[PDB]
């Protein structure tokens, strides 16, 4: 997307695995605020806009 048009997309009613993200072997500045990325997969929250 563009930064004049980064749309607030709603991906819903499915599941997103994050363990392949740590083994993607390409991340540069992977920054998690609030909760640690170790405890991201097991517990989830509402409002999962992207």
């Amino acid at each position, epitope marked *: 997307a563009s930064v004049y048009a980064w749309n607030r997309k709603r991906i819903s009613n499915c599941v997103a695995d994050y363990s392949v993200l740590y083994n993607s*072997a390409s*991340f*540069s500045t992977f*920054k*998690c605020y609030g909760v*640690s*990325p*170790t405890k991201l997969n097991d517990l989830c929250f509402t409002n999962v806009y992207a």
Partner: nanobody
Amino acid sequence: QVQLVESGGGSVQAGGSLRLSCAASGSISSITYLGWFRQAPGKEREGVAALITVNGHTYYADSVKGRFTVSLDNAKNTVYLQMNSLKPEDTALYYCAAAAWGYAWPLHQDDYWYWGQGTQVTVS
């Protein structure tokens, strides 16, 4: 809440070998990322070595590429930094840093790290 104790420094000639260590104590399972720093006299503290604890992925700077190795020992709770093929531009104060938020390549000083006391490595 995370205390780092580092050792293994000393003086060695050019072409020699050294092996730094940095033991961790506290909330060990929350720490996801260990990075090694280096601050030369007259230069800014930059990023040299990097290691994700969960993934095992190693990241090295371009000035130390092909020479420097970082390894993790979960049983002794201590990250290592083996010094191979040393040159006299490596005379600096080295620092080990721990992160409980994730990984960031390149290393930056302004992020939140658990800082140690630093070890003097002098080569000539």
